[PDB]
Amino acid sequence: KVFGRCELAAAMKRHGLDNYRGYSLGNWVCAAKFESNFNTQATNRNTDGSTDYGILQINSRWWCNDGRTPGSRNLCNIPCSALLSSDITASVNCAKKIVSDGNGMNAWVAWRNRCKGTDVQAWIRGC
Ligand code: NA
C-alpha cells in the first residue's frame, strides 16, 4: 500500500509514534518519505546480505527474519514479510524497539541524511 502523506501521519499518530522516544510526528513521516516513498511494500537489498523492508525500511540483520541473512538476529520476533503489510502495526511496533535501542532515529539512514536538522514539521502540515 502506498500511503498518502497525512493518511500516514494519522496512521502513525494512532499507533502512538508522535513524540515517541522524543521524536515528533513529522520526523517519522519524513523518514517514511525518503526511506520508502510512503510504500509499505518497499524492499532494498544491501551488500552485506541483509534487506530493508517496509515503509520504514527495517533491516533483517537485526530486526526481522527473512531466512537468508547470514549471522543475523530477529529482535522484533517477526518475519520480514510482516513489515510489508498494508497494516503498519508490525512496522511501528518494531520501529519503537529500534528507536529505543539507543542512537535514536539515527538507525534510519534516509532520516539522517534528508530529515535530521530540517523542517520536518512540514510533513504533517495541513493534516
Ligand atoms: Na494502518
Residue numbers in the entry: 1 to 127
From the paper:
HEWL, a small enzyme (14.3 kDa) is one of the most common model systems to study interactions with compounds (e.g., drugs, metals, etc.). HEWL has 17 positively charged (6 Lys, 11 Arg) and nine negatively charged residues (7 Asp, 2 Glu), thus leading to a net positive charge at pH below the isoelectric point (∼11). For this reason, we investigated the use of the sodium salt of hexatungstotellurate(VI) Na6[TeW6O24]⋅22 H2O (TEW) as an additive in crystallisation experiments with hen egg-white lysozyme (HEWL) as a protein model for X-ray structure analysis. The negatively charged TEW polyoxotungstate binds to sites with a positive electrostatic potential located between two (or more) symmetry-related protein chains.
